[PDB]
Amino acid sequence: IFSVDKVRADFPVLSREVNGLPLAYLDSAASAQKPSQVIDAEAEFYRHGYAAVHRGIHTLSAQATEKMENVRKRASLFINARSAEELVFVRGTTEGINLVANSWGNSNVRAGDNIIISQMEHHANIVPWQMLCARVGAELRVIPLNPDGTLQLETLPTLFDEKTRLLAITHVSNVLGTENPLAEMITLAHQHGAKVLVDGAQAVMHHPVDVQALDCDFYVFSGHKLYGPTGIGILYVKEALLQEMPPWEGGGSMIATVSLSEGTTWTKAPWRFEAGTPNTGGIIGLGAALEYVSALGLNNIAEYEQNLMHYALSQLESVPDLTLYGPQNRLGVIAFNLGKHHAYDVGSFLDNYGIAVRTGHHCAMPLMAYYNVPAMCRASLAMYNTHEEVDRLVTGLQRIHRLL
Amino acid sequence: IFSVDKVRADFPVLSREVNGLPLAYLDSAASAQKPSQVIDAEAEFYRHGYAAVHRGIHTLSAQATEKMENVRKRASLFINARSAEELVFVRGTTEGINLVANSWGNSNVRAGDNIIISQMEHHANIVPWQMLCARVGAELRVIPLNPDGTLQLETLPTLFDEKTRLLAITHVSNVLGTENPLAEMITLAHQHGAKVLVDGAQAVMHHPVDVQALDCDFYVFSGHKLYGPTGIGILYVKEALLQEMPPWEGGGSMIATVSLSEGTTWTKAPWRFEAGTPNTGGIIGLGAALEYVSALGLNNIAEYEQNLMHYALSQLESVPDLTLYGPQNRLGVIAFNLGKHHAYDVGSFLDNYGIAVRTGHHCAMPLMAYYNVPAMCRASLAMYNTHEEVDRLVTGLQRIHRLL
Amino acid sequence: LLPDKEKLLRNFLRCANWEEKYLYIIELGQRLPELRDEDRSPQNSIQGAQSQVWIVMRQNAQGIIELQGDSDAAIVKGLIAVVFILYDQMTPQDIVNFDVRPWFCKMALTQHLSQGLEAMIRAIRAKAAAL
Amino acid sequence: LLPDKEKLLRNFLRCANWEEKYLYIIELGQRLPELRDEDRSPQNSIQGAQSQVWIVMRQNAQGIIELQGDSDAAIVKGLIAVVFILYDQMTPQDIVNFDVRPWFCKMALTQHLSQGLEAMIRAIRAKAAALS
């Protein structure tokens, strides 16, 4: 079984006092706290074995390169990819989506084509495709939303045509916690000739993800949202497509020869999309966090998180004039608004009570405009949050409702 | 004054045994070891105050945003830029040069123009400009090298012209240790209406740098070579030239608005080129590293480094058939070959003596080509390298020559 | 109406805790007169405060400046009112040369909240200097 | 001539320390038959070996694989020699199915030195698989 006490024992920030009170971090969706294991992994790699990682000659460099490739293999086993050479290291889901849009996009989308996204999509899953459409001259069609935070799938027949090139969809929505039918939408997309990219920046930390079961052609996620360090993230690409995509950033490592009179040639897959010195410590920490989460078992995490979400949704009914956004079966996050009170005030107060929630548009403004609001308050229910923190949040919401 | 014992004290890696023998890390020019100060700044930030940094409403998030911006100010004051808003966080010198070439290149370089590089440039300062000249159909021009590894400045007349848009030069060469005259090149390039980009990745860690005394238009450097964490790098840009450049990566935070019907509007400088979540941990560590170095004082460090370099050059005169590349007034790195023996074999034997030196083309194939060689060995004398390591290298080279 | 900077700072320091201070700010914002729907336009919108903010400045029948404001956020409107108080009954030059810093320091706002108020003050000072 | 994998492993484990083992690799490289100037072309180049490595494989009159190579790095050439010794007198299927991991385990070449060796093994297995 799962024991949130032992788990919280490992995150040191969970001992901070925010504004004179013990901190209750409810913004893991914005970024997850890192256990002591990941901090120590990174810091130890730094202390007793740091060196360059470009197949160097001396022992330390070759060991560091081995370590980085082992981390890549662990990450490939995580999502269940066929080959470790189908995962590229990036800065995060944002840079991964940009890379896919520039590399694969600029060579696979032209004038007259069209790209399909959802109205719930994060800005990271919206802006790159807009830039691409503006560059090549393609159309961007949006999957509408239903009031309950789910996709109007019945509109799919009128959005996919012989010219649909890509479906960039979100796995778990970082605002509504909705989970889209990835396999079915992906089957429909593959029936037309349009690839599929999946933004799972929010889905990985809750349940197991199987890039071969979804058949998605691109999958992305960020490391700071998986209890690991920042600056690192994973972009999985089907080997078939990845072996044919040109290079994005240009420099050292990703090349095979560099001549000022005979041109330049590029290296094989994964590395061709990893210019300059990679974030070695970040990769060490990301592997450490992967090992941690796997040791805890994603299914126990998901069971605990679903029970905690049900408890919190039951408790938030005793808050008058609260308005929630998303389906009942949401994951990880609750978006809401306390009466006619602006989200900024609800959040400022909650934080003055030591409670940390995110307030505003959450890099998902089209969602806001759909919902006819200017902002929302999101709270994250991570694996290290307790029922007592849910009670503190309901308490703060009720006291704010009174005082306002 | 300086004291290398107390300095080595802060480097845990400098107590590691390689192949059974005390390590002598002479590969800092490919990557510098970190003092426990940087490791610990990053670990403490992860342990006692981590949170997303997007001007979050809760205390941890606002504190983290202030920490990142204070590190940005420390960066701007290190190189001595006018404004802290004249610096952008990137992953490294490679990504920074790619960004300069894509944001500022596509709009300031048209067909018919010509860019000017040098024959000793790193690949990160060669590949981006080649890709750019391919995208816009411009011509790439090169400043040749003299036998002594110094630039043939005389050939500047036949290279600069009214179509010359940019001069991309390296402050110090990672292979020869040569230090090009940046001020005069920059004056001559500005007289031709050409901007100047300076890859100073090998210069910031040996002596003080002043982007106003040089008047360069763009400056780049990476932190993993600055004794700081990986995946973090500084791109300085002139405020005038920066506030006009279009945004490169698209995502969250770097947008003022994101409308699927009225287009996407951008946000002001630096933050326009910081898509998605920035490496907060890397940035904290880079602040720590800058603090440590500033404490040690670049002047004392340069004194000790020139002393160690002159000692190493005096002691290497007793190694038979040793060919050195570069001028006598080099900084940080010695590039050599041992007789006719290949670089890989010398490096391999040295490694098995505990001596970590790099072997290969050092991401500078045109340099290798100019020197009629297929590869060199490079040994870097950092601020923590002693005389004993110099003697060990000399003895190892002697033994390698006798045995081979 | 709104109290003067003297009574404002006094009644603020008289607050017993930070909750009372924040509620007093929300109330001060509540006191601000309603903004004309015409003035609630982009030409009068401010940016950088994380919430919609409108601030219109105009010289009355004299060289004196009159300020109207609104913000979709309660505490933001309260800060608008605090500013209006600090810049109450002053000509463009008097606003250009008035040091609001010691007032906020004696109110300790940056230590309990920080940049949106700075942006509002900058916009008001830009208007006053243009005048 | 080059020793068989059995004699190779025996003589290598007979090495008292490591310098002898590295010079034995260097020598084994120095025993290879020279490479035709025609075969040292970009069509026979191997990447990831941190040195210019040429390797050519071809089936003779039978279904037997005949290998040749060269490297501007002595120890890389010795690795070429050792890989050739391990894969000697075999058809493409024998090459694909043969697991070479335990021989390296018995000679300890990744704990001493090994990624260019991985590049060589992968390229040879790719040629064998394309042939079978």
Residue numbers in the entry:
A (entry chain B), B (entry chain A): 2 to 405
C (entry chain D): 3 to 115, 120 to 137
D (entry chain C): 3 to 115, 120 to 138
Sentences from the paper on this structure:
The cysteine desulfurase, SufS, provides sulfur in the SUF Fe-S cluster bioassembly pathway. SufS is a dimeric, pyridoxal 5'-phosphate-dependent enzyme that uses cysteine as a substrate to generate alanine and a covalent persulfide on an active site cysteine residue. SufS enzymes are activated by an accessory transpersulfurase protein, either SufE or SufU depending on the organism, which accepts the persulfide product and delivers it to downstream partners for Fe-S assembly. Due to the buried nature of the active site, these enzymes require a dedicated accessory protein called a transpersulfurase to act as a second substrate in the reaction.
Here, we report the first costructure for the SufS–SufE complex from E. coli. We obtained crystals of SufE C51A/E107C bound to SufS and solution of this structure indicated an EcSufS/EcSufE complex with 1:1 stoichiometry between the S and E subunits. The crystals diffracted anisotropically to 3.2 Å along the b-axis and c-axis, but to only 4.2 Å along the a-axis. The overall structure contains one EcSufE monomer per EcSufS active site and is asymmetric with one EcSufE positioned closer to the EcSufS active site, though neither pairing is in a persulfide transfer ready position. The overall asymmetry is best described as a rotation of EcSufE toward EcSufS resulting in a closure of approximately 7°. The more open interaction is based primarily on contacts between EcSufE and the α16 helix (residues 343–353) of EcSufS, while the closure creates additional interactions between the C51 and R119 loops on EcSufE and the R56 loop and α4 helix of the adjacent SufS monomer. H343, D346, and Y354 of EcSufS hydrogen bond to D74, backbone amides of A76 and I77, and E21 on EcSufE, respectively. The remainder of the α16 helix interface is made up of nonpolar interactions between EcSufE and Y345 and F350 on EcSufS. The EcSufE residues in these contacts are located in the C51 loop (residues 47–53) and the R119 loop and flanking regions (residues 112–128); however, the loop surrounding R119 (residues 116–120) lacks density in both EcSufE subunits. These two regions form layered interactions with the N terminus of the α4 helix (residues 60–67) and the adjacent R56 loop (residues 56–59) on EcSufS, with R56 appearing to block formation of a closer complex.
